[PDB]
Nucleic acid binder design. Structure first.
Ligand SMILES: [Mg+2]
Ligand SMILES: [Mg+2]
Ligand SMILES: [Mg+2]
Ligand SMILES: [Mg+2]
Length: 1408
RNA sequence: AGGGACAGGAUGUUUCAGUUAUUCGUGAAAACGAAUGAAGUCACUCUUAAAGUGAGCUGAAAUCACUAAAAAUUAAGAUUGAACCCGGCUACUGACUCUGUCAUCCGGGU
DNA sequence: TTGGTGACA
DNA sequence: TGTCACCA
């Protein structure tokens, strides 16, 4: 009947405490504890940044390919002959390295003319005393652009000497110049020369510079002369090439988006239509209107699109900035009472209700604006109906009735309503006023319709209660509906409807202050702009979030915002408001209630920022809300409900989706494990919590680059959060000034914190009366031994305590004083208990000791009790929606089969409340449930947090009634009861991405690592009978072959031949790369003859892999120190092992890669000869910081200046032999259609399992490649064909006999070279095998990393060769407890594990 | 500021090819320039003048596969998201033009 | 992190 | 066949 889920969201770790029970709170069993170890972005990718970067790399490559296709098509159409390879190469050279179109600016100057160089001398060394900075900067714009030594030195000194400003403070205080101008100059002046870095060295050039370069060097290219002659001029060909180079990927795509375009057909009309469509796509700047007109008149009016390209100027066709503002606009979240669902539920009856209620005089004036606001579509369903032109449900009359009905339902309790929300409530008591409401309702609406009307009204208010809680998705049968349509962006027509919400004006038709002026020219312009400048140019003081006033609503320090900013604002505020004071009066609300200097004013992001995106809701919703909140009319209805917007952080949405899926999956397994088969309504209530630690830990997982700064600011936020200590200024300070309030005295430094209204009496009240600050008290434990959970009156307090606190011991006098003092402070002031003065705060606290008939007693209790129902955050709302949807999806079959009904409810628990008020109590009771001070809470402590969330929700009244766990039992017995409920085991869930072996769209996974590896075959040198494999005849360059005849007999058909060119010279045989790769692919992809197998084997003997690595690799960037020759010239990077057997000529040895000579002459360069030492021990403490720049200067050189369109060189490299991992060759085609082979490395698993024969014998040696790699263009390096009639999967677990009964060992193949081992054993036995302590299992990490000594101890003490050792000591825990389950990947497989799993597999296989 | 998306830029890695220079100013050659579309330099092994090999340089091409005209394809998968194309202005949204066209929009499809 | 590959003995 | 290092 009752299913409960307590979840603590903490980012990486999400604790869970779940139970499904029939009678109240569960037994000791039926309760389960889980922690989700959510993998980081590397193990499970949530962010799309890498995917998007790969997509745009692909799109840039495709843009170039399609531009080259179109250029060849057009040049061959005009040429009327096929382009030769030389002409194609020249054209592609013209097309390569087209310039950029963004991130460039010329200059500006506003403040440099008004500063003195005599005071800038502290940062500028060479400018004279009386010089002006503007002229010097104008000279520098040319000096540094010419890379003049003096100008660059001056700017470098300007940047280097301005690191401190202590002297400049005295300078400005000695002459009293305006610091704002000099600060502006320094903040627009002290920028690094990006315009030089990414112009001269990095090769970034603007599109206009690219066009000028190609115009310069098209004549000089002799390959283009036939094409220039065909185009009848260099200028025309330049215009053609530049116009084609300006096309985006989408234009070329549109041209080539046709199956017949694979023939490269030149279509005149298609190209014209594409070019017209291409440049009509752009939103041009207002300045470029004439350029847009020129381009569109050229293309649209083109009688010959090729001649238009030849004549239209390329500089005009450079596309403007990508105005992607309309990409996926926001959807309005407003909830609307729907005539569609009202007609689905009921017939014409509901419109009859609306008409009957409209006939009543009390409905006078409710439909004033429905003649005008109904014209604007407000929902998605109405949009669909109007698009179809077949309005049925949303006919204007039905919509009028829906709006009127919603206004009647959303009527405020004071606005002449029928006391709805009271006739509906189950607590409706027989009263005269409820009659004076219901009789009016039945007089107006009628007598027959009233039952159905009130059922509808109850359903409506239940739905809006869910909606305002952020849980509108729980209803499962909505009667309102979301808008789901885009609102317009903030244009003037919309600001007309948004100005009134701030100025509190009843209505506004024209922007007369802007259209026609009132108080001269500056009625608004520059006058409110002074206020805007004050808002924006004070940096972090005024408009910045994380301010004290706005981040936590502490209202500044005390008042430090007023006397520093608003005193300056006051004059402008008066001047602006004098205009509206003539046209509007209000009850002083236009400037003292609605408009404020800060906080609720929000003028910064509504009125003072034009457009700036989309408005929140559609204009229909805005008009409805403005009418309901009638301002001058003192409101008429409650504002429209809205659904919770999805989280803006997409990676957060993915993380929450995965967490919700995992938790809903485990809850589905838990409910499906039950034997329920009746019509029972199973209510699933979820309890959730989180805090700033959630954001701090989700800065991780995402692995955000800002994680340093995010944690830097969240650490300050967390310090502020923890600063709320001593229960908000309590203990020995507030309630008592010392000693104890009940007898006691001589308290000392230690006491205890106790309540005034304990659990038993508090359970009769709602909300936070049980735990509020005004309820808690500090007392001696012996003093609190009496009246443990009973009412505490004034007389129970010690007389001396009242004499110290209030000055007299008379209870009557003190209660009269409390009644006097508490009445002076308003409700909203006493609720904010921290803002109170200590006398007032103690009066509020003591108000609880008064009897029930007291006014202060009842007022304080009915304030602190019904304080709030904590709304879920947007992130929490998203997680809740995802979990509820996925659980209700995964259990649909089970609920259908067993006729179960999953009712859902949800409540939030404050993280600070549970951690401070239940976690510490459970630390008292157990001492293993205490919160550590490790600066990061451990894994099982999140399951502890979830259990404490359940415990806290037990004491919340409404939750307890809806949870089935309501009881008035005292604290002691309750804490001794719920402590019995916490299980001794914690299951750890570590979500994983789908293995590429199991996912059908393998393209969603990165198949190959970026970076291509060079593939080489060792040359074969023959000089008579003397045959060597290698490069030279030196013993270090080649190895000898005992019998060359066998090697050549094998490789007859695969060797090229270089003849002697002399009589005593040798012959060089090189493997033909094309035939070698074809043969290796054939032996990988199909069964081949033994000749081909031998040929592939010998080819792989001759095969070696190299890859160029930058010459800067001789420098260690982290240590800022050069590496030694022992590290640079390590033999592992240069030696090739030759192991030709007796079958293949018996050549055995090692060959040094001849790139080692290049590396040697690199480390022996005269500039680097002394900076690089010879041995590791010789590399002492000396460090050189500018080594990388030195190497760049080594290899950078100036060219002959042949071509303006030449690529710059930035990386110089030499080959080395790298460490490889699952090499794969990819067969592709060059631009001429010739097959090219390039070697990559697999990014993921290579083998799908192991082959098992018809007798169940697992082949542990043969690698069974996955089927996605068995393509006609893919060749797995060293791969052989293998047929698997049946095979064992890598994820196939079987328990291993292992010859023991105290342990349970399971293993699976897991990985080709390493098995996975899962061990279930006692925690004490694990701590005996390993030198691992970690205290209790509640402090254990999910990822245990044994030290090398601990690894050796585990291996030795296990006495189990079939366990191996964990790889790098990493152990992943699956369950925590007295019995421990964990799994690990073995460091290396051994035959005992293989034999044991073979026996386990045979046990199942022979069973069949 | 977060996220997503568009537009890409530039350098890399690999494959292929060329290259290990030739003519003129002027011819002493001091003396290096120019041009040949660009590049044209070093190292080792060979033993006769040519070479083999490796590197550098220059140019282009390729730079996940199925897979190819375009698209999707480097996220996730229990589900989805995003992208792109086609049709439409009956209509939510954006741009503009003399306001009806075009879209990032809507509806479908992959 | 992890699936692979080399060298060593 | 295990062992130890290394790669992105
Ligand atoms: Mg892609
Ligand atoms: Mg390769
Ligand atoms: Mg390279
Ligand atoms: Mg279209």
């Amino acid at each position: 009947v009752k299913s409960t889920l307590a979840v603590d969201m903490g980012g990486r770790y999400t604790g869970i405490f779940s139970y499904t029970t029939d009678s109240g709170f569960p037994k000791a069993k039926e309760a389960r504890a889980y922690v989700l170890n959510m993998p980081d972005n590397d193990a499970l990718t949530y962010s799309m940044a890498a995917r998007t970067q790969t997509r745009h790399r692909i799109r840039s490559q495709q843009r170039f390919v399609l531009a080259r296709r179109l250029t060849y098509i057009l040049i061959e159409g005009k040429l009327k002959r096929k382009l030769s390879p030389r002409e194609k190469e020249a054209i592609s050279s013209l097309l390569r390295r087209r310039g950029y179109s963004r991130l460039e600016s010329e200059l500006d100057l506003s403040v440099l003319q008004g500063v003195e160089s005599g005071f800038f001398k502290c940062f500028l060394p060479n400018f004279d005393e009386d010089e002006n900075l503007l002229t010097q900067w104008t000279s520098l714009t040319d000096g540094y652009l010419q890379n003049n030594s003096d100008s660059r030195r001056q700017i470098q000194i300007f940047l280097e000497s301005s690191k401190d400003s202590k002297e400049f403070l005295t300078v400005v205080k000695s002459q009293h110049q305006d610091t704002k101008e000099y600060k502006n100059a320094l903040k627009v002046m002290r920028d690094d020369a990006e315009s030089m870095i990414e112009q001269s060295m990095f090769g970034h050039k603007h599109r206009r510079l690219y066009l000028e370069a190609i115009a310069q060097d098209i004549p000089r290219d002799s390959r283009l002369k036939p094409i220039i002659e065909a185009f009848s001029g260099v200028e025309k060909f330049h215009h053609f090439i530049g116009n084609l180079s300006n096309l985006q990927l989408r234009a070329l795509r549109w041209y080539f988006n046709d199956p017949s375009m694979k023939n490269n057909v030149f279509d005149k009309e298609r190209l014209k239509s594409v070019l017209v469509r291409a440049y009509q796509f752009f939103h041009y700047p207002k300045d470029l209107t004439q350029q847009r007109a020129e381009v569109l008149n050229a293309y649209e009016g083109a009688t010959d699109i090729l001649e238009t390209l030849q004549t239209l100027n390329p500089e005009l066709t450079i596309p403007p900035y990508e105005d992607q503002n309309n990409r996926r606009p926001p959807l309005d979240q407003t909830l609307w009472l729907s005539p569609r669902l009202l007609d689905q539920r009921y017939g014409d009856t509901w419109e009859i209700w609306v008409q009957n209620l409209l006939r009543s005089p009390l409905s006078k004036g409710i439909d004033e604006n429905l003649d005008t606001i109904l014209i604007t579509t407000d929902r998605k369903a109405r949009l669909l109906e109007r698009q179809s032109g077949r309005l049925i449900h949303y006919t204007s009359q039905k919509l009028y009735h829906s709006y009127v009905l919603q206004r009647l339902l959303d009527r405020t309790v004071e606005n002449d309503a029928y006391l709805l929300k009271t006739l509906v409530s189950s607590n409706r008591g027989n009263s005269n006023e409820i009659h004076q409401a219901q009789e009016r309702l039945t007089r107006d609406l009628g007598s027959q319709h009233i039952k159905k009307f009130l059922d509808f009204v109850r359903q409506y208010y239940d739905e809006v209660d869910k909606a305002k809680r952020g849980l509108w998705f729980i209803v499962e049968k909505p009667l309102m509906e979301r808008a789901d349509i885009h609102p317009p962006m903030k244009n003037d027509s919309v600001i007309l409807r948004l100005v009134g919400n701030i100025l509190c004006v009843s209505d506004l038709v024209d922007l007369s202050f802007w259209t026609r002026k009132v108080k001269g020219q500056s009625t608004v312009r520059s006058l409110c702009t002074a206020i805007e400048k004050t808002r924006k140019e004070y940096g972090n003081s005024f408009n910045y979030l994380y301010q004290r006033a706005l981040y936590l609503q502490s209202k500044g320090k005390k008042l430090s915002a007023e006397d520093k900013d608003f005193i300056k604002l006051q004059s402008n505020v008066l001047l602006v408001s004098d205009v509206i004071a003539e046209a509007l009066d209000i009850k002083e609300e236009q400037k003292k209630k609605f408009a404020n200097p800060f906080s609720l004013a929000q003028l910064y992001n509504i009125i003072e920022t034009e457009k700036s995106g989309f408005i929140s809701t559609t204009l229909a919703a805005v008009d409805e809300n403005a009418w309901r909140n009638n301002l001058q009319g003192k409101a008429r209805c409650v504002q429209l409900c809205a659904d919770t917007v999805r989280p803006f952080d997409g990676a957060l949405r993915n993380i929450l989706d995965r967490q919700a899926y995992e938790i809903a999956k485990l809850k589905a397994e838990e409910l499906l494990s039950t034997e329920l088969k009746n019509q029972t309504i199973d209510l699933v209530v979820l309890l959730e919590s989180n805090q700033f630690a959630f954001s701090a830990s989700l800065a991780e997982v995402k692995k955000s680059a800002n994680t340093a700064a995010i944690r830097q600011k969240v650490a300050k936020a967390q310090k502020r959060q923890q600063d709320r200590w001593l229960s908000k200024d309590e203990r020995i300070k507030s309630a008592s000034r010392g000693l104890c309030p009940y007898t006691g005295k001589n308290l000392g430094d230690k006491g205890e914190v106790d309540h005034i209204i304990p659990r038993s009496l508090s359970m009769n009240y709602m909300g936070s009366i049980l735990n509020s600050e005004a309820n808690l008290i500090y007392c001696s434990q012996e003093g609190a031994q009496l009246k443990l959970n009973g009412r505490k009156k004034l007389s129970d307090l010690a007389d001396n305590y009242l004499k110290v606190v209030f000055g007299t011991a008379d209870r009557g006098t003190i209660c009269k004083y409390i009644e006097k003092s508490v009445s002076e402070l308003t409700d909203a002031k006493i609720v904010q208990f921290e803002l109170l003065d200590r006398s007032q705060q103690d009066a509020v606290r003591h108000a609880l000791f008064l009897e029930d008939f007291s006014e202060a007693r009842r007022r304080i209790i009915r304030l602190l009790g019904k304080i709030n129902t904590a709304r879920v955050n947007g992130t929490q709302a998203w997680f809740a929606k995802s979990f509820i949807t996925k659980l209700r999806e995964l259990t649909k079959e089970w609920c259908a089969n067993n006729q179960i009904t999953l009712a859902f409810d949800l409540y939030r628990l404050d993280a600070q409340t549970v951690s401070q008020d239940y976690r510490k109590k459970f630390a008292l009771i157990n001492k293993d449930w205490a919160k550590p001070d490790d600066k990061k809470q451990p894994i099982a402590s999140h399951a502890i947090d979830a259990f404490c969330v359940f415990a806290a929700a037990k004491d919340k009244r409404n939750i307890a009634n809806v949870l089935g766990v309501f009881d008035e039992v005292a604290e002691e017995q309750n804490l001794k009861t719920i402590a019995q409920l916490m299980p001794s085991e914690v299951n750890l869930i570590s979500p994983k991405r789908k293995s590429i072996l199991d996912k059908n769209e393998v393209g969603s996974r990165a198949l190959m690592k970026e970076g291509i590896f060079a593939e080489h075959f060792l040359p074969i040198l023959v000089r008579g009978d003397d045959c060597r494999i290698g490069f030279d005849w030196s013993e270090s360059g080649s190895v000898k072959v005992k019998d060359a005849d066998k090697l050549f007999g094998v490789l007859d058909g695969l060797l090229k031949q270089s003849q002697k060119r002399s009589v005593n010279g040798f012959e060089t045989y090189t493997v033909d790369r094309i035939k070698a790769f074809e043969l290796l692919h054939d032996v990988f992809i199909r069964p081949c003859s033994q000749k081909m197998l031998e040929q592939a084997e010998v080819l792989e003997k001759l095969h070696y892999i190299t890859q160029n690595i930058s010459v800067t690799s001789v420098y260690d960037a982290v240590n800022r120190q050069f590496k030694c020759r022992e590290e640079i010239l390590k033999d592992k990077d240069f030696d090739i092992k030759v192991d030709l057997g007796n079958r293949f000529g018996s050549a055995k040895g090692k060959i040094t890669l001849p790139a080692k000579r290049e590396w040697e002459k690199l480390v022996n360069r005269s500039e680097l000869k002394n900076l690089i030492k010879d041995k590791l021990s010789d590399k002492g403490s000396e460090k050189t910081p500018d080594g990388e720049t030195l190497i760049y200067d080594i290899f950078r050189s100036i060219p002959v200046q042949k071509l303006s369109h030449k690529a710059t060189r930035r990386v110089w490299s030499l080959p080395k032999i790298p460490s490889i991992s699952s090499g794969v060759r990819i067969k592709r085609k060059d631009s001429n259609g010739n097959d090219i082979y390039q070697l990559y490395m697999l990014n993921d698993t290579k083998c799908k399992g192991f082959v098992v024969n018809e007798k169940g014998v697992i082949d542990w040696s043969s690698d069974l490649v996955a089927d996605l790699y068995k393509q006609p263009t893919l060749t797995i390096l060293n791969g052989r064909y293998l047929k698997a009639d049946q095979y064992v999967r890598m994820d196939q677990w079987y328990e291993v006999d292992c010859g023991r009964d105290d342990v349970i060992v399971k293993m699976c193949p897991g990985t080709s070279g390493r098995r996975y081992i899962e061990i279930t054993q006692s925690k004490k036995q694990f701590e005996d095998w390993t030198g691992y302590i970690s205290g209790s299992f509640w402090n254990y990490p999910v990822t245990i990393k044994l030290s090398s000594q601990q690894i050796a101890n585990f291996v030795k003490n296990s006495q189990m060769p079939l366990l191996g050792k964990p790889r790098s000591g990493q152990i992943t825990v699956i369950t925590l407890g007295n019995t421990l389950k964990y799994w690990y990947c073995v460091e290396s497989k051994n035959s005992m594990m293989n034999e044991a799993y073979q026996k386990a597999y045979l046990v199942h296989f022979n069973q069949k």
